Design a protein around this motif. Structure first.
Motif, PDB file in Angstrom:
ATOM      1  N   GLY A 163      -7.604  -3.619  -8.963  1.00 57.03           N
ATOM      2  CA  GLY A 163      -7.588  -2.274  -8.437  1.00 57.03           C
ATOM      3  C   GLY A 163      -7.583  -2.350  -6.924  1.00 57.03           C
ATOM      4  N   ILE A 164      -7.818  -1.197  -6.297  1.00 54.56           N
ATOM      5  CA  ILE A 164      -7.815  -1.117  -4.839  1.00 54.56           C
ATOM      6  C   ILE A 164      -8.765  -0.008  -4.396  1.00 54.56           C
ATOM      7  CG2 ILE A 164      -5.827   0.451  -4.683  1.00 54.56           C
ATOM      8  CD1 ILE A 164      -4.920  -1.316  -2.209  1.00 54.56           C
ATOM      9  N   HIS A 165      -9.396  -0.212  -3.238  1.00 53.98           N
ATOM     10  CA  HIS A 165     -10.299   0.764  -2.649  1.00 53.98           C
ATOM     11  C   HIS A 165      -9.568   1.683  -1.675  1.00 53.98           C
ATOM     12  CE1 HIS A 165     -13.408  -2.125  -4.035  1.00 53.98           C
ATOM     13  NE2 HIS A 165     -14.153  -1.038  -4.125  1.00 53.98           N
ATOM     14  N   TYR A 166     -10.189   2.829  -1.406  1.00 58.29           N
ATOM     15  CA  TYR A 166      -9.704   3.738  -0.376  1.00 58.29           C
ATOM     16  C   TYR A 166      -9.723   3.059   0.986  1.00 58.29           C
ATOM     17  CZ  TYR A 166     -10.087   7.702  -3.592  1.00 58.29           C
ATOM     18  OH  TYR A 166      -9.931   8.569  -4.653  1.00 58.29           O
ATOM     19  N   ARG A 167      -8.802   3.486   1.857  1.00 57.72           N
ATOM     20  CA  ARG A 167      -8.735   2.907   3.192  1.00 57.72           C
ATOM     21  C   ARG A 167     -10.036   3.131   3.952  1.00 57.72           C
ATOM     22  NH1 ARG A 167      -5.237   3.167   8.647  1.00 57.72           N
ATOM     23  NH2 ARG A 167      -4.187   1.152   8.371  1.00 57.72           N
ATOM     24  N   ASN A 168     -10.649   4.307   3.790  1.00 57.00           N
ATOM     25  CA  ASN A 168     -11.883   4.588   4.514  1.00 57.00           C
ATOM     26  C   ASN A 168     -13.006   3.660   4.080  1.00 57.00           C
ATOM     27  OD1 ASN A 168     -13.915   6.386   6.038  1.00 57.00           O
ATOM     28  ND2 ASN A 168     -14.634   6.494   3.907  1.00 57.00           N
ATOM     29  N   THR A 169     -13.027   3.288   2.800  1.00 50.49           N
ATOM     30  CA  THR A 169     -14.045   2.377   2.296  1.00 50.49           C
ATOM     31  C   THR A 169     -13.856   0.971   2.848  1.00 50.49           C
ATOM     32  OG1 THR A 169     -14.022   3.685   0.254  1.00 50.49           O
ATOM     33  CG2 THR A 169     -15.109   1.509   0.161  1.00 50.49           C
ATOM     34  N   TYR A 170     -12.613   0.604   3.142  1.00 52.62           N
ATOM     35  CA  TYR A 170     -12.241  -0.770   3.472  1.00 52.62           C
ATOM     36  C   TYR A 170     -11.174  -0.690   4.565  1.00 52.62           C
ATOM     37  CZ  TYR A 170     -12.042  -5.802   1.979  1.00 52.62           C
ATOM     38  OH  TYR A 170     -12.120  -7.172   1.888  1.00 52.62           O
ATOM     39  N   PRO A 171     -11.574  -0.296   5.773  1.00 53.07           N
ATOM     40  CA  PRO A 171     -10.601   0.010   6.830  1.00 53.07           C
ATOM     41  C   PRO A 171      -9.944  -1.229   7.406  1.00 53.07           C
ATOM     42  CG  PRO A 171     -12.851   0.228   7.631  1.00 53.07           C
ATOM     43  CD  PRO A 171     -12.940   0.118   6.149  1.00 53.07           C
ATOM     44  N   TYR A 172      -8.836  -0.993   8.111  1.00 57.67           N
ATOM     45  CA  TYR A 172      -8.013  -2.077   8.624  1.00 57.67           C
ATOM     46  C   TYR A 172      -8.583  -2.664   9.912  1.00 57.67           C
ATOM     47  CZ  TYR A 172      -3.918  -4.707  10.060  1.00 57.67           C
ATOM     48  OH  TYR A 172      -3.073  -5.725  10.424  1.00 57.67           O
ATOM     49  N   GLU A 173      -8.714  -3.988   9.936  1.00 55.19           N
ATOM     50  CA  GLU A 173      -9.316  -4.708  11.052  1.00 55.19           C
ATOM     51  C   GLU A 173      -8.343  -5.628  11.782  1.00 55.19           C
ATOM     52  OE1 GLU A 173     -13.393  -6.034  10.292  1.00 55.19           O
ATOM     53  OE2 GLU A 173     -13.003  -5.586   8.176  1.00 55.19           O
TER      54      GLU A 173
ATOM     55  N   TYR B 218      -4.918   3.971   0.841  1.00 55.86           N
ATOM     56  CA  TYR B 218      -5.555   2.804   0.240  1.00 55.86           C
ATOM     57  C   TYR B 218      -5.592   1.643   1.233  1.00 55.86           C
ATOM     58  CZ  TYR B 218      -5.368   5.575  -3.933  1.00 55.86           C
ATOM     59  OH  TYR B 218      -5.550   6.601  -4.839  1.00 55.86           O
ATOM     60  N   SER B 219      -6.321   0.586   0.862  1.00 62.14           N
ATOM     61  CA  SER B 219      -6.749  -0.435   1.822  1.00 62.14           C
ATOM     62  C   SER B 219      -5.755  -1.590   1.933  1.00 62.14           C
ATOM     63  CB  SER B 219      -8.122  -0.980   1.441  1.00 62.14           C
ATOM     64  OG  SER B 219      -8.488  -1.982   2.366  1.00 62.14           O
ATOM     65  N   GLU B 220      -5.043  -1.652   3.060  1.00 65.06           N
ATOM     66  CA  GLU B 220      -4.305  -2.861   3.410  1.00 65.06           C
ATOM     67  C   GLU B 220      -5.241  -4.041   3.644  1.00 65.06           C
ATOM     68  OE1 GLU B 220      -4.150  -0.126   5.323  1.00 65.06           O
ATOM     69  OE2 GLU B 220      -2.155   0.782   4.989  1.00 65.06           O
TER      70      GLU B 220
ATOM     71  N   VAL C 120       0.819  -1.212   0.000  1.00 63.40           N
ATOM     72  CA  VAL C 120       0.000   0.000   0.000  1.00 63.40           C
ATOM     73  C   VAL C 120       0.858   1.270   0.000  1.00 63.40           C
ATOM     74  CG1 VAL C 120      -1.559   1.343   1.441  1.00 63.40           C
ATOM     75  CG2 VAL C 120      -2.131  -1.015   0.847  1.00 63.40           C
ATOM     76  N   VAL C 121       1.981   1.284   0.737  1.00 61.53           N
ATOM     77  CA  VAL C 121       2.838   2.471   0.707  1.00 61.53           C
ATOM     78  C   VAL C 121       3.250   2.791  -0.724  1.00 61.53           C
ATOM     79  CG1 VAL C 121       5.009   3.523   1.488  1.00 61.53           C
ATOM     80  CG2 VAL C 121       3.667   2.085   3.047  1.00 61.53           C
ATOM     81  N   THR C 122       3.613   1.765  -1.498  1.00 60.06           N
ATOM     82  CA  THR C 122       4.057   2.030  -2.861  1.00 60.06           C
ATOM     83  C   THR C 122       2.903   2.486  -3.742  1.00 60.06           C
ATOM     84  OG1 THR C 122       3.765  -0.223  -3.725  1.00 60.06           O
ATOM     85  CG2 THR C 122       5.803   0.237  -2.526  1.00 60.06           C
ATOM     86  N   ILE C 123       1.676   2.029  -3.471  1.00 62.90           N
ATOM     87  CA  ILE C 123       0.535   2.487  -4.264  1.00 62.90           C
ATOM     88  C   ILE C 123       0.219   3.939  -3.936  1.00 62.90           C
ATOM     89  CG2 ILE C 123      -1.912   2.115  -4.787  1.00 62.90           C
ATOM     90  CD1 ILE C 123       0.067   0.019  -5.891  1.00 62.90           C
ATOM     91  N   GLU C 124       0.152   4.270  -2.643  1.00 63.47           N
ATOM     92  CA  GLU C 124      -0.060   5.662  -2.248  1.00 63.47           C
ATOM     93  C   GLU C 124       0.971   6.582  -2.894  1.00 63.47           C
ATOM     94  OE1 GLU C 124      -0.006   5.022   2.051  1.00 63.47           O
ATOM     95  OE2 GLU C 124      -2.129   4.434   2.064  1.00 63.47           O
ATOM     96  N   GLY C 125       2.228   6.136  -2.955  1.00 63.56           N
ATOM     97  CA  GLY C 125       3.277   6.965  -3.525  1.00 63.56           C
ATOM     98  C   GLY C 125       3.129   7.167  -5.022  1.00 63.56           C
TER      99      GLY C 125
END
Length: 212
Positions: free
Chosen positions: A79-89, A48-50, A31-36
Protein backbone atom coordinates in the motif's frame (compact mmCIF):
# COMPACT_ATOMS: atom_id res chain seq x y z
CA UNK A 1 -11.19 6.69 -27.64
CA UNK A 2 -11.71 10.45 -28.10
CA UNK A 3 -9.52 12.96 -29.88
CA UNK A 4 -8.64 14.82 -26.65
CA UNK A 5 -7.97 13.52 -23.12
CA UNK A 6 -6.88 15.68 -20.17
CA UNK A 7 -7.18 14.06 -16.75
CA UNK A 8 -6.62 17.46 -15.12
CA UNK A 9 -10.10 18.46 -16.33
CA UNK A 10 -11.58 15.41 -14.56
CA UNK A 11 -9.97 16.41 -11.26
CA UNK A 12 -7.63 13.40 -11.26
CA UNK A 13 -4.25 15.20 -11.17
CA UNK A 14 -2.66 16.87 -8.13
CA UNK A 15 -0.36 19.93 -8.29
CA UNK A 16 3.00 19.69 -10.05
CA UNK A 17 5.90 18.62 -7.83
CA UNK A 18 9.65 19.20 -7.86
CA UNK A 19 11.88 16.18 -7.26
CA UNK A 20 14.95 18.37 -6.71
CA UNK A 21 18.43 17.02 -7.30
CA UNK A 22 17.45 13.50 -6.20
CA UNK A 23 17.00 10.89 -8.94
CA UNK A 24 13.52 10.02 -7.65
CA UNK A 25 11.53 10.61 -10.86
CA UNK A 26 10.51 6.94 -10.92
CA UNK A 27 8.69 7.44 -7.60
CA UNK A 28 7.05 10.69 -8.71
CA UNK A 29 5.88 9.01 -11.91
CA UNK A 30 4.40 6.08 -9.99
CA UNK A 31 2.62 8.39 -7.53
CA UNK A 32 0.91 10.35 -10.34
CA UNK A 33 -0.67 7.12 -11.58
CA UNK A 34 -1.79 6.16 -8.06
CA UNK A 35 -3.36 9.57 -7.42
CA UNK A 36 -5.17 9.24 -10.75
CA UNK A 37 -6.55 5.72 -10.38
CA UNK A 38 -7.76 6.38 -6.82
CA UNK A 39 -9.70 9.43 -8.04
CA UNK A 40 -11.08 7.46 -10.99
CA UNK A 41 -12.16 4.51 -8.80
CA UNK A 42 -13.25 6.31 -5.59
CA UNK A 43 -14.07 9.92 -6.52
CA UNK A 44 -11.45 11.43 -4.19
CA UNK A 45 -8.23 13.16 -5.23
CA UNK A 46 -5.47 12.68 -2.66
CA UNK A 47 -1.70 13.13 -2.69
CA UNK A 48 0.43 10.06 -1.95
CA UNK A 49 4.02 9.62 -0.78
CA UNK A 50 6.90 9.66 -3.25
CA UNK A 51 9.25 9.52 -0.24
CA UNK A 52 7.78 6.20 0.90
CA UNK A 53 8.54 4.62 -2.47
CA UNK A 54 12.02 6.20 -2.48
CA UNK A 55 12.80 4.71 0.95
CA UNK A 56 10.98 1.39 0.71
CA UNK A 57 11.28 0.06 -2.86
CA UNK A 58 14.12 -2.42 -2.36
CA UNK A 59 14.40 -3.06 -6.12
CA UNK A 60 15.19 0.61 -6.83
CA UNK A 61 18.30 2.65 -6.04
CA UNK A 62 16.99 5.60 -4.03
CA UNK A 63 18.22 8.90 -5.44
CA UNK A 64 20.37 6.97 -7.94
CA UNK A 65 17.30 5.97 -9.97
CA UNK A 66 14.74 3.22 -9.99
CA UNK A 67 11.83 1.48 -11.63
CA UNK A 68 8.22 2.72 -11.87
CA UNK A 69 7.08 -0.89 -12.23
CA UNK A 70 8.60 -1.97 -8.91
CA UNK A 71 7.26 1.12 -7.15
CA UNK A 72 3.80 0.25 -8.43
CA UNK A 73 4.22 -3.38 -7.35
CA UNK A 74 5.07 -2.15 -3.85
CA UNK A 75 1.75 -0.27 -3.72
CA UNK A 76 -0.15 -3.35 -4.91
CA UNK A 77 1.50 -5.74 -2.45
CA UNK A 78 1.49 -3.45 0.60
CA UNK A 79 0.00 0.00 0.00
CA UNK A 80 0.98 3.65 0.25
CA UNK A 81 0.61 6.49 2.76
CA UNK A 82 -0.66 10.01 2.21
CA UNK A 83 1.97 12.57 1.24
CA UNK A 84 1.29 14.56 4.41
CA UNK A 85 1.96 11.48 6.54
CA UNK A 86 5.23 10.78 4.71
CA UNK A 87 6.39 14.04 3.09
CA UNK A 88 9.10 14.43 0.49
CA UNK A 89 12.63 15.03 1.77
CA UNK A 90 14.73 14.75 -1.39
CA UNK A 91 17.11 12.14 0.08
CA UNK A 92 16.68 8.41 0.64
CA UNK A 93 16.13 7.43 4.28
CA UNK A 94 15.09 4.26 6.10
CA UNK A 95 11.71 2.81 5.20
CA UNK A 96 9.32 4.21 7.83
CA UNK A 97 5.99 2.76 6.68
CA UNK A 98 5.64 0.50 9.74
CA UNK A 99 5.89 3.50 12.10
CA UNK A 100 3.40 5.74 10.26
CA UNK A 101 0.22 3.74 10.89
CA UNK A 102 -2.06 1.98 8.41
CA UNK A 103 -1.64 2.57 4.69
CA UNK A 104 -3.91 5.14 3.07
CA UNK A 105 -4.48 3.36 -0.25
CA UNK A 106 -3.72 0.04 -1.90
CA UNK A 107 -3.92 -1.18 -5.49
CA UNK A 108 -4.44 -4.65 -6.93
CA UNK A 109 -1.63 -4.99 -9.46
CA UNK A 110 0.45 -3.48 -12.25
CA UNK A 111 0.27 -3.78 -16.04
CA UNK A 112 2.66 -2.88 -18.84
CA UNK A 113 1.59 -1.18 -22.06
CA UNK A 114 2.77 -3.04 -25.14
CA UNK A 115 5.99 -1.13 -25.91
CA UNK A 116 6.82 0.75 -29.09
CA UNK A 117 3.13 1.12 -29.95
CA UNK A 118 1.60 4.60 -30.01
CA UNK A 119 -2.03 3.49 -30.17
CA UNK A 120 -1.59 1.10 -27.25
CA UNK A 121 -0.27 3.93 -25.08
CA UNK A 122 -3.07 6.29 -26.13
CA UNK A 123 -5.62 3.60 -25.27
CA UNK A 124 -4.16 3.29 -21.78
CA UNK A 125 -4.07 7.08 -21.30
CA UNK A 126 -7.73 7.26 -22.29
CA UNK A 127 -8.42 5.02 -19.28
CA UNK A 128 -6.05 6.51 -16.64
CA UNK A 129 -2.75 8.36 -16.18
CA UNK A 130 0.20 6.18 -17.22
CA UNK A 131 3.85 6.07 -16.13
CA UNK A 132 6.12 6.59 -19.15
CA UNK A 133 9.84 7.17 -19.73
CA UNK A 134 11.74 9.46 -22.09
CA UNK A 135 15.16 10.93 -22.84
CA UNK A 136 15.43 14.15 -20.84
CA UNK A 137 19.21 14.63 -20.89
CA UNK A 138 19.27 16.80 -24.02
CA UNK A 139 19.40 20.56 -23.62
CA UNK A 140 16.34 21.01 -25.85
CA UNK A 141 14.20 19.09 -23.38
CA UNK A 142 15.87 20.76 -20.39
CA UNK A 143 15.16 24.25 -21.78
CA UNK A 144 11.63 23.56 -23.04
CA UNK A 145 9.28 26.50 -22.45
CA UNK A 146 6.13 25.55 -24.34
CA UNK A 147 4.52 24.34 -27.52
CA UNK A 148 4.39 20.88 -29.02
CA UNK A 149 7.89 19.51 -28.45
CA UNK A 150 9.48 17.65 -31.38
CA UNK A 151 13.03 17.45 -30.08
CA UNK A 152 15.82 17.31 -31.05
CA UNK A 153 16.19 14.24 -28.86
CA UNK A 154 17.38 10.67 -29.05
CA UNK A 155 15.80 7.55 -27.60
CA UNK A 156 18.23 6.89 -24.71
CA UNK A 157 15.56 7.06 -22.03
CA UNK A 158 16.64 8.32 -18.61
CA UNK A 159 13.65 10.04 -16.98
CA UNK A 160 10.31 8.74 -15.72
CA UNK A 161 7.25 10.98 -16.00
CA UNK A 162 3.48 10.57 -16.30
CA UNK A 163 1.19 10.86 -19.30
CA UNK A 164 -2.08 12.50 -18.25
CA UNK A 165 -3.66 13.23 -21.61
CA UNK A 166 -3.22 13.60 -25.35
CA UNK A 167 -4.52 15.38 -28.43
CA UNK A 168 -4.35 14.85 -32.20
CA UNK A 169 -0.66 15.85 -32.39
CA UNK A 170 0.74 15.35 -28.87
CA UNK A 171 0.82 13.43 -25.61
CA UNK A 172 0.41 15.49 -22.41
CA UNK A 173 3.10 14.87 -19.77
CA UNK A 174 3.26 15.85 -16.08
CA UNK A 175 6.94 16.40 -15.24
CA UNK A 176 8.43 16.59 -11.73
CA UNK A 177 10.68 19.64 -12.23
CA UNK A 178 8.41 22.22 -10.58
CA UNK A 179 5.81 24.64 -11.88
CA UNK A 180 8.37 26.95 -13.50
CA UNK A 181 9.49 24.40 -16.12
CA UNK A 182 7.61 24.02 -19.39
CA UNK A 183 3.87 24.74 -19.51
CA UNK A 184 3.37 25.27 -15.77
CA UNK A 185 5.23 22.00 -15.21
CA UNK A 186 3.82 20.08 -18.21
CA UNK A 187 5.14 19.25 -21.67
CA UNK A 188 3.20 18.35 -24.80
CA UNK A 189 5.32 15.93 -26.84
CA UNK A 190 4.67 15.41 -30.55
CA UNK A 191 3.04 12.13 -31.58
CA UNK A 192 2.16 10.60 -34.93
CA UNK A 193 5.66 10.73 -36.42
CA UNK A 194 5.73 7.00 -37.25
CA UNK A 195 8.87 6.41 -35.20
CA UNK A 196 8.15 3.31 -33.12
CA UNK A 197 10.39 4.57 -30.30
CA UNK A 198 8.24 7.67 -29.84
CA UNK A 199 9.66 11.18 -29.76
CA UNK A 200 12.45 11.10 -27.16
CA UNK A 201 11.85 7.35 -26.76
CA UNK A 202 8.43 8.00 -25.20
CA UNK A 203 7.08 4.49 -26.04
CA UNK A 204 9.95 2.51 -24.47
CA UNK A 205 8.51 1.48 -21.08
CA UNK A 206 5.00 2.30 -19.82
CA UNK A 207 3.16 0.95 -16.77
CA UNK A 208 -0.08 1.64 -14.95
CA UNK A 209 -1.70 0.45 -11.70
CA UNK A 210 -4.78 -1.75 -11.58
CA UNK A 211 -7.43 -1.13 -8.92
CA UNK A 212 -10.71 -3.04 -8.68
Amino acid sequence: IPEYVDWRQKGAVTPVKNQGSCGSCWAFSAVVTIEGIIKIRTGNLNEYSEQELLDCDRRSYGCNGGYPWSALQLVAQYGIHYRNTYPYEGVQRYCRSREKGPYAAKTDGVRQVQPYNEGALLYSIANQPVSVVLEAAGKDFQLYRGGIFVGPCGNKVDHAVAAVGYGPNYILIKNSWGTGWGENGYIRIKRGTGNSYGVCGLYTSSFYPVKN
